[PDB]
Design a protein around this ligand. Structure first.
Ligand SMILES: [Mg+2]
Ligand SMILES: [Zn+2]
Lengths: 286, 37, 120
RNA sequence: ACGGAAGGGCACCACCAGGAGUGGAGCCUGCGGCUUAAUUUGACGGGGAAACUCACCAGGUCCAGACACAAUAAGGAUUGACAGAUUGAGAGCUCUUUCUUGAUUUUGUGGGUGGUGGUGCAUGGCCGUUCUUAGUUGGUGGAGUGAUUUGUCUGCU
RNA sequence: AUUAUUGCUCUUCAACGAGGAAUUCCUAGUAAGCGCAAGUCAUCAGCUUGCGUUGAUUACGUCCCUGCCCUUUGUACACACC
C-alpha cells in the first residue's frame, strides 16, 4: 500500500533515475539495466546504480533477471511517487496522511498544500499486485475520466468537490467539511433540502447524466455556519454514472428518486407532497 | 518461560510441562506424543 | 604567498602556505555546519528510540522536520518525543545498532572579513 | 526467458442454482489515526486480560574500577551488630551512641579487567522456509567444427 | 476493583421497520439454528478448538470471470526499423 513518508528520502537524482525507468517501461516492457544507464542522461554507474539501489530498497522497483535478460519493474509505489513528485513540482501537494475513504478502485487520503489549506487525494488502484500494462494504464485513464467529469461538474454549478489536479491515476480535490446521510441526525429545513436534492437530479438529467447510485452515504452535507446553519449538498458519483441514452436510464433515475424519498421518509419522517419527477420529463428536458 | 530455549513466548503452560510450542513440537516424540492422525 | 611574521627566526617570517589569486566572486557563500550527536538507545523492527541529543520535548518539536543521518551512511527522520527528558523515537533507512551515531546537520551563513595592508 | 497466439483441464479461497449472510444499527474486539508524561511493540503474535505478565511513563534508590600505580595509615585507612536522630510518596542516606573496628584501605592516574560487553569473520552444526522437488537426471550410443541435438515422438491414450 | 473485574436487585429503555456500492463461507448428518466442554483461567468472551442436539434449500454443470496449471505455437524486442 501507500507509505508516503519514504518519498522524502529521495534526492534529485533518485527521482531522475525513477523518471528514466518511467520513460523506459512505457516504451519497452521490462527496462534493462543499460536502458536505464543510457536514457537517464546521467554521468556514470555511480549515480544510476546508487539511485536504483535506493528505489529497490524502498520498493519502487523490482529486479527481473530472466535467463541473462536483466531488467527492472516499476511497482505501484513508483508511479505514486512520480505523480506525487510531479505535484511537488506543480506546487499542489506538500503533506499527506489521514485515510478516510477506502474504495475498491479508489483510495482517499487527507492532504495539504503550501498554504495550509486542507484537501483530499483520490488515487486509483485497479487490481490491488500483479502489475501488467492494463492495471496502471486503466487506473491512469480512470482518474483522467473522473477528473474530467469532476471539472465539468464544478464548471456547471453543481455542488460537487472542486477538482484541483489529476496527477495520473491520482487526483487532488477539495476537502469538504461535510457529513453523510448516515451521520446526520436532523435538519432545520428538510423540505428545502429535499427540494434541492430533487432539483439536482432534475438538472443532472438535464445535463445528460443519471448517477445510478444516489444513496445515503453518497451525499455529503457541508455546514458553513453554526449560528445560521448553512448546508451544501455534495455528491460523489462518476464511474457509476449512466448517460441519458443508455437502454436502462429509466429505472436508474427512478431508483435515485425512490431512494431520496425513502430516506427522507425514514430518517427525517418527511414525505414529498409533489409527485416525484419521472424519467420522461427529464428525457425531454435534455 | 520455556525451560529449553530462554523464551518467554510460545509457552505451553499446560500440565506443568512449560515448553514453548516450537521446542515442545520437537521434544514431542521423546515425551510420548506421536503422529497418528 | 601566505605567511605569519615571526620575529624569532632569522627570516622574520614564518612561511605558512602558497597558492594563487583565483576569483573575484561574491556568489561564493560559506555555510558553517553544526552537527548534533545522539546515541540510538533502543530497537524495534522499524522504530528506534534515540538518546542524548536533546533534553526537552519542545526542543525535539522544534527540530522535527530536520533529517537524521548516521555516519554508517543511513538516513531517517524523527517521529515523536518519548519522555520529559528529550528521548525521541525515530524511523530509518537501514537497521542500526548501538554502535552507530544519529546526527543532525544545521547550517549558518559565514561572512568574509575586512583586510588591512601590511608594512615593515 | 516472454506472450495479452491458440488448446485443454478443473478448482465453491472460481462461476451457476441457491442457503446463510456481512456491508446499514447498537455493543465487542483487533488494526490505523489522533491524544497522551507513557498510551511498549511487532506484522495473529498463545497478544487474553487492575499488581505480576511489561518490555512504556513521572519521580526516589543502590552497586560500580578487575587491577596496576602514587600518597595516607596501625599513635588510624576504613568494613561488620544495633538504638534513636531519620524520612520524602515508600526505602535507603548520613552522624551521635553502645559496639565490631583493624587495611576489605580512602583518594588520584593509566593500558584494559568486566567481557553476569554487546556487535562482525571463519568453522562445525541444529529449528524455519524452496525447485515447497511431483518429470527430471546422468550413463553409454547416433548427428553436428560448435552452441546444441536425438532419447524427451506422427499417432492414440 | 477509582477509569466502574464480574455476578445479583430495582430503574433508565438510545439506535435499529431486512439494510447502498460491494463481498465472505458452503454440496449430507453437510449449511444454518442451538448450547456445552476444554484452553487462556485468580474474575470474565462477544476469543479459540472440539462436541452433541435440531437439521434444509441447490448443483453433481461449466470454463463465463477468479486463479492454478499443462500443452501447442511463434519469437527475446536475440534489445528489428521509425
Ligand atoms: Mg553422447
Ligand atoms: Zn523453546
Amino acid at each position: 500500500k501507500l507509505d508516503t513518508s519514504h518519498m522524502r528520502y529521495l534526492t534529485t537524482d533518485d527521482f531522475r533515475v525513477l523518471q528514466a525507468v518511467e520513460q523506459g517501461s512505457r516504451s519497452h516492457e521490462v527496462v534493462p539495466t543499460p536502458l536505464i544507464h543510457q536514457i537517464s542522461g546521467m554521468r556514470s554507474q555511480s549515480g544510476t546504480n546508487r539511485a536504483i539501489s535506493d528505489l529497490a530498497k524502498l520498493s519502487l522497483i523490482s529486479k527481473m533477471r530472466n535467463v541473462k535478460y536483466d531488467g527492472y519493474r516499476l511497482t505501484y509505489n513508483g508511479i505514486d511517487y512520480l505523480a506525487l513528485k510531479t505535484m511537488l513540482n506543480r506546487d499542489t501537494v506538500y503533506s499527506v496522511g489521514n485515510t478516510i475513504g477506502v474504495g475498491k478502485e479508489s483510495d482517499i487520503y487527507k492532504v495539504s498544500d503550501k498554504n495550509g489549506n486542507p484537501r483530499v487525494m483520490k488515487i486509483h488502484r485497479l487490481g490491488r499486485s500483479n502489475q501488467g500494462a492494463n492495471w496502471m494504464h486503466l487506473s491512469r485513464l480512470a482518474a483522467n475520466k473522473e477528473y474530467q467529469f469532476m471539472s465539468m461538474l464544478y464548471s456547471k454549478g453543481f455542488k460537487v468537490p472542486e477538482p484541483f489536479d489529476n496527477s495520473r491515476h491520482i487526483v487532488v480535490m477539495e476537502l469538504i467539511e461535510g457529513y453523510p446521510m448516515r451521520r446526520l441526525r436532523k435538519h432545520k429545513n428538510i423540505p428545502k433540502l429535499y427540494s434541492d436534492l430533487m432539483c439536482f437530479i432534475v438538472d443532472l438529467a438535464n445535463s445528460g447524466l443519471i448517477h445510478c447510485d444516489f444513496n445515503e452515504f453518497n451525499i455529503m452535507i457541508k455546514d458553513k455556519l453554526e449560528d445560521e446553519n448553512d448546508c451544501g449538498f455534495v455528491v460523489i458519483d462518476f464511474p457509476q454514472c449512466i448517460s441519458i441514452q443508455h437502454q436502462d436510464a429509466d429505472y436508474y433515475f427512478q431508483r435515485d428518486v425512490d431512494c431520496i424519498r425513502r430516506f427522507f421518509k425514514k430518517k427525517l419522517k418527511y414525505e414529498p407532497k409533489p409527485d416525484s419527477s419521472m424519467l420522461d420529463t427529464e428525457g425531454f428536458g435534455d | 518461560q520455556c525451560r529449553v530455549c530462554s523464551s518467554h513466548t510460545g509457552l505451553i503452560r499446560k500440565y506443568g510441562l512449560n515448553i514453548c510450542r516450537q521446542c515442545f513440537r520437537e521434544k514431542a516424540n521423546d515425551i510420548g506424543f506421536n503422529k497418528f492422525r | 604567498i601566505f605567511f605569519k611574521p615571526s620575529p624569532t627566526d632569522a627570516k622574520n617570517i614564518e612561511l605558512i602556505g602558497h597558492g594563487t589569486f583565483l576569483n573575484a566572486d561574491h556568489s561564493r557563500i560559506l555555510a558553517k555546519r553544526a552537527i548534533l550527536t545522539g546515541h540510538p538507545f533502543r530497537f524495534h523492527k522499524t522504530v528506534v528510540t534515540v538518546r542524548y541529543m536533546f533534553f526537552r520535548p519542545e526542543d525535539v518539536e522544534w527540530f522535527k522536520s530536520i533529517p537524521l543521518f548516521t555516519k554508517s551512511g543511513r538516513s531517517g527522520f524523527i517521529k515523536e518525543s518519548l519522555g520529559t527528558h528529550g528521548y525521541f523515537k525515530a524511523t530509518f533507512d537501514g537497521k542500526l545498532s548501538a554502535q552507530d551515531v544519529v546526527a543532525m546537520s544545521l547550517y549558518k551563513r559565514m561572512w568574509p572579513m575586512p583586510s588591512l595592508p601590511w608594512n615593515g
